Design a protein around this ligand. Sequence first.
Ligand SMILES: [O-][O-]
Ligand SMILES: [Cu+2]
Length: 142
Amino acid sequence: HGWVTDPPSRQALCASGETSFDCGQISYEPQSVEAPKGATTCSGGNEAFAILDDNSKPWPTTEIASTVDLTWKLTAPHNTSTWEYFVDGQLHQTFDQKGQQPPTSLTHTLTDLPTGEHTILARWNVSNTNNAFYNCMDVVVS
Ligand SMILES: [O-][O-]
Ligand SMILES: [Cu+2]
């Protein structure tokens, strides 16, 4: 269990009261967006958190540079295979944790992000279950 706090993920914005709409249950447990491996959606297909896939909502965006430090908060630091970062659904960078336990505060540096409005999907793959955690971040790169 864990989520991306900076730049804030969709679930982080719900939990921080930064959205102008009610997100429902996700606002109380941003760490819990768990679903089977292999998805490329913001909820991972976890039906309890389908609001995270709704692009019609006025999701806030964060202004960032083309190289950015991204920070996770993990409440339960499961042994991890990879952290995968997608930009608009296409794989951009992978970090290999080698099946080890990560720190509960973890920062990764993404580079060469395209300019303009994009959605980054961070997929955290757990090495000893069939689940991943899914975090979308809406950003404007300049
Ligand atoms: O706890 O996954
Ligand atoms: Cu967990």
